[PDB]
Each structure stands twice: as structure tokens, then as C-alpha cells.
């Protein structure tokens, strides 16, 4: 790294970067009916399952609780707007093209282009249950059932659309109060100053910025199509849950010391006093297998709550406002964030400002005018050869050092690195 | 939602809103003495429980660890001030009435009015243990005991009182260093500018603001008295723990394949070599039931740690400072937060600023004076018909556009939406 | 606490404080090979372990998953910089001495002095495995093995060094974009204004500040050497994991109702049909003991993920930037943070600004000049006896009230506490 005693580097150009962050929000809601799972509707087992007390009750309630939380997680992340907003047929945003994030009415569920890519990338035992369709299926899947969400894909898509329409047409104001319309270019102006970059930069370079933005968005399609760009975070949710269910199914073929894995064969060709023992032994193992499954699900559920809580936080701080937290809403300086829906989760597109080309300048902590030390009101002092200028830290825009750009504090005998120069007084030429 | 290409909406009025957020901090500390729980002080079981190794040791330590954490959670949230502060007998806060949050010496535990409402709203097996009062009770409750907190309700109330006295008389300064006294109206002035609202608004509308505040507080009583306003978050802590204990008790009546659920009846009327088997079978089930209980408690404890950590964060960022994080300290723009104690948790009253009435104005990104582009130093440009003004974004207070309200950057041929107008120079009239 | 109606306290001096925060990041990666752990390579057990299905498969995968996460946790916290940076041989930082945090080439692993203290303070069954060295050891430790980290101490130290070199020579810029060199004294200047303290304070008191800093660092050695200054947070990780392993080992000596705890003795002197029963009974208990162990490890792993996530957040917000969050990066106002490596965790040295000596002044919300109310542009109005001044809140530096220090809003009949005084107009003396 460069290191200096008397010099400074300042960016002369910048780029706009759009990055993708993918967070899990929820998982497929499932339930296992302990009694039929273990006994298979056999009478002898059912009676021998009551002597064990309320284990099935606790396990059923543990799983029910998880299923309920999955809907809470979803609404906490997505349902942050009470109103449903729509964009006008007029797309006049100053050169900013949002056609890939806005809903397309010709598409299924009226998803946007990018959302359609996400849905067709994540690959979703569960399908077999969906195909047989609820008791009739439960009788075939050993008490393992799948429950529908309260919010369907369309409902979630509507929330996402409303959030986007709000963000684009009214900035962040709708997240605190009433939605206040404002031209997109002006929202950007106020987001630029919000990261220490004077608003004039946007207006003067608006065309370039719009072009960099539009290209940055197009590149998203290639990133998603080329590799599992954090898509594995959602694919793993599917895979981990699927194999957990496969475990339960496989265990129903185990003996665990029992004469067989089939209750009908235990009862057949065996006197009652022993069949009771073989059944109890099989019940014990199946119950333990079920406990193992539930314990794992309780822990995973906790992980998803934490993820959902983070996703909800991101919605509030990245999308409905402008974060000052470093690397919270992506690398670089945060400007905007645009959410997209996804299978079992939420995807955030983070728009950030990043410095590019830079130059070396000679610097100084203060300027000595006439026995008094002048400090910069905003920015730093730099020398471009034989002349000194004051400029904002994040963009090399040199300006003349004047009495309106500095303040006087203390004398020239106090500051160690103070440099002799002339501060321009803008009023004297008017008197003379 | 409204959407525009050339116009803007600006709030002309505002209201003050007070919302309530309720977080769990801790749960009743309990402990189960594995050996007596399982064996009931029987000799035969005790001896047959040693052959199983250190299961009871691990379970006892798991529960002990949870109980310890409950006190850590409490002190981390509440004990953030080393000193105990008291308010003066003189309540001169500029019209702001805090009588409902400040401690009332005539009340039990010297709680405030609102706190008394919270304590009389949350409804608290455990009571039966409290009534029998420690070994004597343990012998009757099957090894299930309840431990006292290190910090009693009075001690917690004192911490809350100290935090409130600090917040009211010294703002946030005491949270970083020494407590620096400052008039309440001045603290508010500095909290208003902190959300982008010029301090003159407070002083000019101080009476209205104090009235809106006082009414907002009164409405809290109705919200708590009318419905379980997030009070269910605390009632659920009680209910979930109570039923977990009920499960353990119920399981002590189960056979789990054993000849009976009573150790005395297993030993009676049965030869030793078989009684050993029946006892071992019963021990196995009771131990498994205990493991199930402990596992659930470990997971719930984790949830409470996370909640307590959040509550501690809120204390630091909402109460002892001014959050910039969106929707972190309630909806709207954060001004102040006043904590209140509660059964097994903490309640935060969040005071936020919310925009109200609004009007439509015509806008522009810049003004063109004489071949140079003028940008607003702070706020936006708006037209009220035939005249242009500059005003702060969050409150419609129109001012004349002058050379002291703008800065010059670039020329008039660069900015797309630039509007021709006159910028007033305040010095020329003095020369002439 | 002091409380006032018409007065204010303002700090006249300050100190620099350095505090230490210690967070766990990861734990020793271990694995238990279920099959050999339970059966001890006996044939009879191995065959009788297959009838139980996929319990060993699930347990092995549960532990494997934990081990993998431990490396993820480490890289997320430390590997936030792609480049490896080095400091120059010239230590010209304006009087700031970093010799205790920078790497010393004469030391083992090229650690810094403070890091060496941390490594020699935390005390690390596991050592016995390390001493026997992988199957050969597994055969002696009952299937309990220890895995190496992907990032060795040297690699982690290099990341820490790179982060420090960056922080010192280029501030926070390298965390957002390219590394931009800047004199250390200037970085501090921009961190002081970042907490509401005018930059002139640093330059005028640079020597004092450097001295306070250097002493604050030296005191760290005494804090670590004198007491377990949060070092218990790392020692507990070692202790908790060690005893968990000791539990597994102890359980291999239990009978759990079996004829003995030794498979060779169960098989010897016992007919096969019964040996099968005694083995199955022993397998059941050993498997349950293993399940208990794994469950505990899954929960602890979750705690470490949460801790690692916080540590990663601190790296981004405290070290690679400047936090505005209260008490997030230590008590007082945050300036800088310097990370140090440690056994199984990360240590943050937080540099904060704290107000010291203070004085009482009489205050006012506004000044009335000639029928119009003047409000302070920045800071507060105070009286030092018979004269009024305007000064910044966090440091008593009184200045004359002028037209350039205030703004006019409304008239003198609106503000309640307004005080009659004279505002100085700096231009009139030039005309006259
Ligand atoms: C700042 O960087 C941008 C690129 O991000 C430069 O814009 C490009 O300029 C070249 C000509 O040198 C054109 O061929 C490209 O088409 C432009 N790109 C875009 C998106 O318009 C810009 O000129 C640079 N500005 C400075 C001062 O260096
Ligand atoms: C916004 O971007 C989209 C996507 O590139 C543009 O739509 C393309 O327009 C070209 C030219 O007519 C067609 O050849 C492509 O097939 C269109 N792509 C798609 C997916 O429809 C759209 O024209 C751009 N709008 C604006 C105002 O720039
Ligand atoms: C340092 O800044 C000065 C002032 O901008 C530069 O001098 C100007 O150079 C331009 C040509 O690029 C001339 O048209 C101006 O008339 C010059 N102004 C003055 C006051 O001389 C100077 O060249 C810069 N130093 C370097 C090395 O570029
Ligand atoms: C900045 O200017 C001052 C004069 O205003 C310089 O101070 C003088 O330096 C000369 C030597 O060249 C001495 O003989 C004078 O007695 C000094 N006068 C005073 C009032 O100190 C100062 O050295 C200049 N600083 C720099 C960096 O050039
Ligand atoms: C801003 O809103 C407040 C109400 O929140 C208005 O104050 C009320 O004004 C009516 C008269 O129209 C009185 O009857 C109420 O008693 C007032 N309420 C309070 C709490 O004082 C205020 O006038 C509005 N101001 C503007 C400019 O619209
Ligand atoms: C602060 O608010 C309290 C609560 O309304 C006021 O106390 C009430 O005062 C009225 C008038 O004397 C009584 O009729 C009520 O019974 C009182 N309520 C209670 C709970 O005591 C109190 O006067 C207000 N103080 C100020 C300065 O406004
Ligand atoms: C736009 O602003 C101007 C200036 O404030 C308004 O004109 C003033 O109107 C008031 C009456 O409300 C008169 O007393 C002032 O003398 C007028 N000033 C000038 C310069 O004409 C104008 O009415 C506003 N436009 C609209 C539609 O209200
Ligand atoms: C702002 O004022 C400028 C003049 O200072 C206008 O520019 C002139 O426009 C007329 C047409 O009406 C041309 O004939 C002149 O040659 C232009 N002069 C220059 C220097 O460009 C400009 O059009 C005005 N803009 C608006 C929006 O009214
Ligand atoms: C502010 O406090 C510092 C100490 O933190 C004071 O500096 C000390 O001053 C005494 C003399 O009174 C010296 O003996 C010490 O050696 C100084 N300490 C250091 C580190 O230099 C400083 O004088 C105080 N300033 C004010 C205005 O009170
Ligand atoms: C930075 O601090 C270190 C630590 O105190 C200084 O090193 C000491 O220097 C003295 C004087 O030569 C020796 O007696 C000590 O034994 C040194 N300590 C160690 C650990 O080496 C170092 O000189 C200081 N550097 C600067 C520029 O102040
Ligand atoms: C209030 O402030 C005034 C102005 O600074 C103080 O008066 C000055 O006191 C110094 C001595 O310390 C004299 O040298 C100045 O000439 C005085 N200036 C004026 C205008 O009188 C005043 O002493 C301060 N009040 C108190 C109690 O210290
Ligand atoms: C601030 O000065 C104004 C005068 O500019 C004072 O107002 C006058 O007070 C006298 C009584 O002493 C009355 O007789 C005058 O009629 C008032 N004039 C006006 C325009 O109101 C005001 O009292 C002074 N305020 C303070 C705190 O001294
Ligand atoms: C650069 O280093 C020299 C010592 O070699 C020092 O005297 C000078 O003051 C430093 N420059 C600045 C701006 O500090
Ligand atoms: C600035 O100087 C350093 C060496 O001190 C060099 O490595 C770096 O490339 C220079 N940067 C520019 C833009 O010239
Ligand atoms: C409003 O839209 C028109 C196109 O219909 C455009 O020419 C004009 O510049 C827009 N107004 C502003 C302020 O951008
Ligand atoms: C502003 O104009 C929109 C239509 O463009 C309208 O719906 C809205 O109600 C108007 N707001 C006000 C305060 O007039
Ligand atoms: C101080 O208290 C009195 C009442 O005793 C009040 O009249 C005065 O306005 C208060 N001072 C300030 C600055 O508010
Ligand atoms: C300020 O006044 C209070 C009493 O109102 C007193 O306790 C405090 O010590 C005083 N502070 C100073 C610096 O004099």
C-alpha cells in the first residue's frame, strides 16, 4: 500500500456498481403426525403409544410452531407497506432504465424479468405430495404433509412491486410518512450528497451515470445465468430440508433390534406377549428418530429466523432509506437498493458509488495567511504543482482557497505543518 | 402513489407520535434436580441411576447455565448506568408532562403510573412453589424448584428511574461521559435538527409540540388497557414456560412400557431381578423426558439471549442517543425514547416525528442566474405559482433564493432541467 | 445528577481512552467417527449397528457441518482485505507510537507485542492427540479426532497486519475502494470533526493527544497481565469444549444396565443370544450419549456463529470506518479501532474521545437583536458572566456572536427564553 508523510491521493473519476445479495427468509412448512407416523394406523401400536404419555403432543406442537413462524418471517420481511403502489405508463426517469426490475404484465404471476430468472434457477419428496393432491395423501406419505403459505407468490410479488414503485417515485419518504413524489434525478442528487459527494456531480454527469447504471443492471443477468451467484444459499434450503425428510422415511425400514421393520409381520406369527415387546422396541426407535428430526428442524428454524430478521433490517435500512453502515448494503458507498422476490427468500440489488482513477497531490493541514491559521470548511488542501486548492475528499474538483472556504483558528505558530499562502477575499474587489 | 417528472410534494405540518415496543429480556430461573426427579429418593433407583454415568450431571449443568444467563441478560439491558439519579421536586420542562413515566412515591415499589399498568396486566405451578415457601418444597414438587433473581423489581425500577432522570435533565451526554445539565427545550432543539428539521420550528411551535406530546402519552394508557398491545410477547413467556413444566409433571404418571408409574408398586409384589428391569425401563423414559425438556429450554434460552441483546442495543442507541437507523426506534423520525420496566422484560416508548399535511409544488434541479448554475446549499427549489423559493425538505418554510443560500457550479448549458431566475445578492443594497 | 432550567454544562478539556473488547470467532474443529466410537472395531457390534439405520450418518454429518462452519467464521471476520499490505521502515505518524500493535519480525509468527501477550495468556485431551501425531491416533482416542484449520496463525496474522497497515496509512478508503494515502494527523482531524469536534482542536493539541494515546496503549499491557480482562471469554471456549469431550470419554465406562462396559467381556463367557442383547443395550446408551454431545455442540456452534457475525460487523463498522452507533465500538465517542489476533478469537482496541473537566454557564435558546430572533448556526449560546458567546457543544471554545454564526428566523415576540443582546456585523467596519 502507498503510505505518506506529506501527500495525499484523490479520486478523479468514479463508477457505479450493482451487486447482488441473497438471503433466505423461510422454508417449506411441513408437519409430521406422530401417532400415524409411528403406528401406521395399527391398533396394537396406537394403544401401546398412549402408555408413553405426551411425547407426540410435544413433537407435534414443536413442528406446528415452526410452521407458524415461517409465515411470520415472510410478512416481516415483505409486508412493510400497507398500500399497493403502481408505476405510470410513462417511464421518464432521466435515462434510468428499470425495465428489468419492474413487473412485466405478459409474464406469469406478473413477475419482472430478473425475478423470472431467479424462479427458473432454483430447483424445487415434496413434489410427490404436491402431485397426489389432504388425509388421503397423508395415508400414503406416512403422516408427512406439506402446508401452503399464507402469502402466495403473487401476493409477495405485489408487495415487492409496491416497494419498488414507492422507492422510484417517492424515494424513502413513504417509509416514514406519506409518499411525497419527487423526480428520480433529484432523489439521486440527495443520495450523492449523502455520501459526501456534492450534488453538482450528478447533474453535470447525469448521462454518464445513467449509462453506467443501465449497463450495471444488464450484467446482472449474466452473473445469474453463468454461475450459482449465491443461489446456493437458496438451493441449500431445499436440499437440506429434502434430505431431512428422506432420513425419516429411511428410518421406517430399520429394525433397531426389533424382529422386523413391519408392524404387520411383528403381529403375525408371534404370540401377543412378545409382539408387545417387539412393537414397544420399534416404537422407541421410531420415536427417537422423530425426536432427532424435530431437534434438527428447531435449530434450522432458528437460523432462518435470524436470516429473516436480517432481511427485514436490510429492507428498512437499505431499501427504505440510506445506510451509513460500512459494507452493510454492499461494498462502496450506498446509494440505493432494489428488492426482488425469489423462491424461499429475498434478493437485494445494491447500487453503490465506487472511486476509480486517482492522482497524487501534495497536502497541508492548514494555510497561514497573515499570522493566522486558516482551516478548510470542507475538504482538503492540495497542491497541483505551484498552486494550492481546496477540494472535496471524494472527488477531485479543485477550487480557489477563499475566506468563504475556510475558517480562522489560532495563529501560525501553533500548527506543525502549516504552509504560507494567500487566501482570496471576494469582497475587496467590490469595494475597489 | 403519486409520481412526477417536474413536481414535488412538501409537508406543511407535522405531528408527534409515541409508540410502544415490548421486548422479553429474561425468564423465570428454574432448576431440576435430576436424581430426585427420576428416583423420588428411592434407594433402588438411586443405585440403578449411577450405572448410567454422568447424564444427570450434564443435565443439571445445562439448566444451571441457563439460570445464570438470565441474570446476565437482565443486567446487560438495565444496568448501563453506574450512578443512581433523581429528579428535582421542580417539574419545569417547558410544558412537557412526564408524570406518567416518572416514579410515584405513593405507589408500591415506587413505580410510575404506566409501569403499574404493565405489572397489573401480565398474569404470572410456579405460584404453588412460591406459596409453600427450600428442600422441603423440592420434596413435594418432584425436584422442580424456582430460584430468585439477583436484581429484584425495586432494583430494576431504580435503574430505570436513573436512566429517565439522566435522559430528561442531561440528554445523552451521561451515556458517553459526565452528565451535563441542559434545559429540556434545548435538548429537543438539537434532536429536531438531528432529523433535518431546523431548530426554529421547535421554539416557534413549542406550545403545540408540548401539547401533542402530552396527549400522545395519555393515549398509551388506553392502548394498554384496551388490548394486549404486544403484551402477549410477555404473557407467552409465562405460558410457554409453565406448560413445559407441566409436561415434566405429567410424564411422571406414564408407564412407557413399565409395569406401573410408581416405584413403590414396582418394588412391591415383584421379585428383585425383575423389579430392576422395570425400574431401569422407567428410568430410561423419565431421563428421556427430562432430556426433551432441557433441550427445549436450551433453545428458548437462546431466543431470550438474542432478544436481550437487542433490548440492550435499543437502550444504547434509542435511549442513550439518537438513532439514524430506519424503523429501528419506531416509525417516523426518531427524537427520544423513554424506557419502562415490565414483568420479565422491558418496554420502550418511542417518540417520533411524522409529517402531516402536504402540498404540491413545481420544482427544478438548479437556477440559472447569469450564465452560471446555482445549486441549493440546503433544501430544494420550489415554485408557489409565479415565484421561486428555496426550502428545507421536511417542512415547507419558503425563503428567498439568495447568494447565501446557493453555490455556483458549472454553467447553464450543462444542467438539463435548469430554470432561468434571479438570485438575490444581499450586499449590493449596502454599497448602493 | 445536575438538572437545570436556565443553565448548561460544557466540557473544557478531554482525554483519550483505549478499551479492549474480546470476541470469540471459532472453536477447535473436532469430529467423532460414530461407528468406531460405539463399537471399538468389534465385529459383533458393527453388524448390530446397521440394524439401527442412519443415525451414525446423521451424527457424522452434523459434526462435519460444524467443523466446516468454523473456517467460514474465521475467514468472514479476518479475510476482508484481498491485498497484503506492509508498513514502511519510516515511522513518521506525528508522534503516534504503534510499536506495540505492529508486527515484530524478531518474534515467532511475526506477531506484535500485544498479540504475543494474548497468545501466552490463553491456556490450550486435545494436546494428547496433538502429541500422538491420522487413523493410528483415532484407534487410541476412541474415534475422537482433531482437524487443522484452513487458516493458520501466520495467515491470520498476515490479514491482521494488512488491515493495520491499511488503517494507519490510508484510513478507511481502502475498505470502500483503492487505498488512498493520507498523513495520520489528517486522518485524525477528519475523525474529530466526525464526532462534532472542530478539527482545529487536534492540530492545536496534537502533542498532548499523541502523548495521551501512547500512554493509553502502554496501559493495555498492565490490564492484560494483571487480570483476565475478558480473557475468560476465550478461556471458556477451551474449557467448555474440553469437558464436553471428557463427557464422551467417561460414558464409555458406563454400563447403562448392561452386564459390563467392555464389549470383549460381554462377548466372553456369555452365549450369543444374550450377548446380542447386552451389546444392543450398550449401543443404545452409547448412541444416546453421542446424541447428547452432538446436540450440545450444535447449540454452541450457533452461539459462535452469532459471535463471529458480530465480530465481522465490528471489523467493517469500527475498524474500516467510523461508527455513529452509541457504545457499539466502546464507551465515549468513536475515533479509531485497531484489531489484534488471538487464540480462537479477535481482540479490538477501541480508541474513543471522552470529555473531562467541565464548567457551568448561563444559557439561552435565542438572541434578540433588533426585533428579530437569531439562532446559532452551530453550537449553543452561553454567558461567562456579563458577556454572551457562541460555542461548540463538545468543547468550550467561546466565540463572538456574529451574523456569520447565526441565522434569523421569526421575531422576538415568539421565542419564550429569548435574550436581548448585540450581534456583531463584520462588514460594517469595512464600509466605515
Ligand atoms: C470516467 O470513466 C468513464 C467510464 O466509466 C469514462 O467514460 C468512457 O469514456 C470513453 C472514452 O475515453 C468512451 O469510449 C466510453 O464509452 C465512456 N463510457 C461511458 C459509460 O460513457 C469517462 O470519460 C471517464 N472520465 C474521466 C474524467 O476520466
Ligand atoms: C430499457 O432496456 C430494455 C432492455 O434492453 C430495452 O428493450 C430492448 O430494446 C431493443 C431495441 O428496440 C430491442 O431490440 C430488445 O429486444 C429489447 N429488449 C427487451 C427485453 O425487450 C428498452 O428499449 C430500454 N428502454 C429505454 C427507454 O431505454
Ligand atoms: C497548478 O494550477 C495552476 C492554476 O490552475 C496551473 O496554471 C494554469 O495552467 C493553465 C493551462 O493548463 C493555464 O491556462 C492557466 O492560465 C494557468 N494559470 C496560472 C495562474 O498560471 C498550473 O499549470 C498547475 N500546475 C501543474 C503542474 O499543472
Ligand atoms: C511565513 O511568513 C512569515 C512572515 O510573515 C515567515 O516568518 C519570518 O521568517 C523570516 C526568515 O525568512 C524571519 O527573518 C522573520 O523574522 C520571520 N517573521 C516572523 C513574524 O516570524 C515564515 O518563516 C514563513 N513560513 C514559511 C514556511 O515560509
Ligand atoms: C397543524 O396540526 C395541528 C394539530 O395536530 C393544528 O393544531 C390544532 O388546530 C385546531 C384549529 O384548527 C385546534 O382546534 C386544535 O386544538 C389544535 N391542536 C392542538 C394540539 O393544539 C395546527 O393548527 C396545524 N397547523 C397548521 C399550519 O396546519
Ligand atoms: C401532568 O399530567 C397529570 C395527569 O393528567 C396531571 O394530573 C391531573 O390533574 C388534574 C387537575 O388537577 C386532576 O383532576 C387529575 O386527577 C390529575 N391526574 C392524576 C393522575 O393525578 C398534572 O396536573 C399535569 N401536570 C402539569 C404541570 O400539567
Ligand atoms: C407566490 O409567491 C409570491 C410571493 O410571496 C406571492 O405573492 C405575494 O402574495 C401576497 C398575498 O398573499 C402579497 O401580500 C405579496 O405582496 C405578494 N408578493 C409579490 C411579490 O407579489 C404569490 O401570490 C404566490 N403565488 C400564489 C399562487 O400564491
Ligand atoms: C435563459 O436566458 C438565456 C439568455 O441569457 C436564454 O438564451 C437565449 O435565448 C434566445 C431565444 O429566446 C436566443 O436568441 C439567444 O441567443 C440565447 N442566448 C444565449 C446566450 O444562449 C435562454 O434560452 C433562457 N432559458 C430559458 C429556459 O428561458
Ligand atoms: C487537560 O488535561 C491534560 C491531562 O490529561 C493536561 O495535561 C497535563 O498537564 C499537567 C500540568 O497541569 C502536566 O503535569 C501533565 O504532564 C500533562 N499531561 C500530559 C499527558 O501532557 C492539560 O494541561 C489539561 N488542559 C486544560 C486546559 O485543562
Ligand atoms: C515507541 O514505544 C516503544 C516502547 O516503549 C519505545 O521503545 C523503548 O525505548 C526505550 C528507550 O530507548 C527503551 O529503553 C525500551 O526498552 C524500548 N522498549 C521496547 C519494547 O523496545 C520506542 O522507542 C518508541 N518509539 C518512539 C518513536 O517513540
Ligand atoms: C466574560 O467575557 C468577557 C469578555 O471576554 C470578560 O472580560 C475580559 O476579561 C479579560 C481578562 O480576563 C480582559 O483582558 C478583557 O479586556 C475583558 N474584555 C472585556 C470586553 O471586558 C469577562 O471577564 C468574562 N466574565 C468573567 C466573570 O470572567
Ligand atoms: C428587549 O428590547 C426591547 C426594546 O427593543 C424591549 O421592549 C420594550 O420594553 C419597554 C419596557 O422596558 C417597553 O416600554 C417598550 O414599549 C418595549 N418595546 C417594544 C417594541 O416592545 C424588551 O423588553 C427587551 N427585552 C428584554 C428581555 O430586555
Ligand atoms: C515529512 O517528514 C519530515 C521528516 O523527514 C518532517 O520534518 C515533515 O514535517 C513531514 N511533513 C509533514 C507535512 O509533516
Ligand atoms: C502515488 O505515489 C506512490 C508512491 O509513493 C505510487 O506507488 C502511486 O502509484 C502514485 N499514484 C499515482 C496516481 O501516481
Ligand atoms: C417533463 O417531461 C418532458 C417530456 O414530456 C421533458 O421534456 C421535461 O424535461 C421533463 N421535466 C423535467 C423537469 O425534467
Ligand atoms: C398532487 O398531485 C397528485 C396528482 O399528480 C394528486 O393525486 C395529489 O393529491 C396532489 N397533492 C396535493 C396536496 O394536492
Ligand atoms: C426558569 O424558571 C422560571 C420559573 O421559575 C421561568 O419563568 C423561566 O423562564 C425559566 N428560565 C428559562 C430560560 O426558561
Ligand atoms: C454546576 O451546578 C451544579 C448545581 O446546580 C453543581 O452540582 C455542579 O457541581 C456545578 N458544576 C460546576 C463545574 O461548577
Author numbering:
A (entry chain C), B (entry chain B), C (entry chain A): 705 to 828, 833 to 841, 848 to 1146
From the paper:
This metastability, however, constitutes a challenge for producing the S2 subunit (fusion machinery) in the prefusion state in the absence of the S1 subunit. Here, we set out to design a prefusion-stabilized SARS-CoV-2 S2 subunit vaccine enabling robust elicitation of antibodies targeting conserved fusion machinery antigenic sites to limit the impact of viral evolution on immune responses.
Ruling out conformation distorting-mutations and a few additional mutations based on visual inspection, we designed a new construct which we named E-69 and harbors the N907E, D994Q, Q1011M and I1018Y in the E-31 background. Only one region noticeably deviated from prefusion S in terms of local structure downstream of the fusion peptide (residues 833-855). In the intact SARS-CoV-2 S trimer, this region makes contact with the S1 subunit C and D domains of a neighboring protomer, which are absent in our design, likely allowing adoption of an altered local conformation, as is the case in all our constructs. The N907E substitution places the newly introduced side chain carboxylate close to the Q913 side chain amide with which it interacts electrostatically. The D994Q side chain amide forms an intra-protomer hydrogen bond with the Q755 side chain amide and an inter-protomer electrostatic interaction with the R995 guanidinium, thereby strengthening interactions at the distal part of the apex. The Q1011M mutation is likely stabilizing through the reinforcement of local hydrophobic packing with the nearby M731 and Y1007 residues. The I1018Y mutation fills a cavity within each protomer through local interactions involving the CH, HR1, and upstream helix region.
